[PDB]
């Protein structure tokens, strides 16, 4: 009888001056009152939610966290002052420098890595040292405090050295090695990494005869691969990353004024960031015009450089089209239709593959 939900009341009687007695307060009631009464309210069912309590050691000011208004930081003789700066509080008046936050061993390690990676000597030992430095960056389990510095360093090097293919290649390799370390939480920095890579993919000028073109096209291909990796890995925690990348690349692609290298980079980026459906829905319907107002004048050129550019651009477009998926003479009939839809220059190349699934996929969006 002690699980009752009724309130507990006490009544007081007197045995005399200063002699009180207490009894439980009860009262006789009818059965009509008890039986006819309404039931209590049903609570809602169990559920759970999620939110970020802290990010890199700082609590954000979101509705799900407590307000600052309403004893968490040490204030003894030995407590560091820079600790108050690590909590991100506003009233802090102390501004730590690099030496107050990073240990000397980590600073020496950063300097050694940067010295090793940016060496242009052709000696074999230097190549081995560069590979060892890249492996160290890719595997070391104690580089949590140098991540912002790595991102800032890559950004700075790309920004100030756009006329050096070697340095840009090294920066791309370093960026690839950083995002492959399994001990690092990389989500918040994802977009910060996507800006340098993009600059290496659609920049009008890269570097300052054939070897230069080899280097430029290899760098663009590597940038596209890295962009694909970044978009695949970090596309869910950065909700608007994929549409933004796809829109940027598409805007660059549909521009007859750009030189062929930028068009090659743009189509590679569209394929890398959007996907198969992006190519199917956004690229194919516009190809019929593209091959007439862009590809024909370039084809009409006779210089060897023009030939190489035309071949590279056509190959890139063909690869993008093939990326969608990976009967006798009757089949050829279907192929003919493609030459009507994708135009001669690309339609012929796609039909020469003698593929049926690709043909059906391409034809499925003819109405668009």
């Amino acid at each position: 009888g002690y699980e009752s939900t009724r309130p507990l009341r006490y009544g007081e009687a007197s045995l005399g001056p200063g002699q009180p007695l207490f009894y439980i307060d009860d009262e006789e009631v009818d059965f009509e009152k008890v039986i006819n009464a309404p039931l209590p309210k049903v609570p809602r069912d169990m559920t759970f939610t999620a939110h970020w309590l802290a990010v890199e050691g700082v609590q954000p000011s979101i509705p799900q966290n407590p307000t600052t208004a309403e004893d968490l930081l040490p204030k003894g003789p030995g407590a560091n002052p820079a600790l108050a700066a690590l909590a991100g509080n506003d009233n802090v008046s102390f501004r730590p420098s690099v030496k107050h936050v990073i240990s000397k061993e980590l600073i020496l390690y950063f300097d050694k890595i940067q010295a090793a990676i940016l060496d242009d000597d052709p000696d074999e030992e230097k190549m081995r040292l560069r590979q060892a430095a890249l492996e160290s960056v890719r595997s070391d389990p104690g580089l949590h405090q140098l991540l912002p510095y790595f991102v800032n360093f890559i950004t700075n090097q790309v920004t100030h050295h756009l006329d050096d293919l070697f340095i840009l290649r090294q920066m791309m390799e370093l960026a690839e090695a950083v995002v492959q370390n399994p001990t690092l939480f990389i989500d918040p920095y994802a977009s910060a990494l996507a800006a340098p890579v993009l600059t290496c993919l659609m920049s009008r000028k890269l570097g300052k005869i054939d070897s230069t073109l080899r280097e430029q096209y290899s760098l663009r291909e590597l940038a596209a691969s890295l962009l694909s990796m970044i978009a695949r890995k970090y596309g869910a925690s950065n909700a608007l990353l994929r549409p933004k990348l796809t829109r940027t690349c598409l805007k660059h692609f549909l521009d007859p004024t750009r030189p062929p290298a930028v068009l090659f980079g743009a189509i590679s980026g569209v394929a890398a960031s959007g996907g198969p459906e992006a190519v199917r829905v956004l690229v194919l319907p516009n190809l019929k015009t593209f091959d007439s107002a862009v590809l024909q004048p370039l084809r009409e050129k006779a210089g060897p450089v023009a030939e190489l550019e035309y071949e590279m651009l056509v190959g890139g477009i063909v690869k993008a089209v093939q990326s969608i998926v990976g009967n006798g003479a009757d089949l050829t009939r279907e192929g003919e239709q493609v030459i009507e839809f994708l135009g001669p220059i690309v339609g012929q190349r796609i039909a020469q593959l003698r593929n049926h699934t690709l043909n059906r996929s391409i034809l499925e969006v003819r109405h668009l």
Binding site: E277, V281, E364, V365, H367, L368
Partner: peptide, 8 residues
């Protein structure tokens, strides 16, 4: 949206 796009 993809189905709508595929709709003739």
């Amino acid at each position: 949206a993809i189905e709508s796009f595929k709709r003739p």
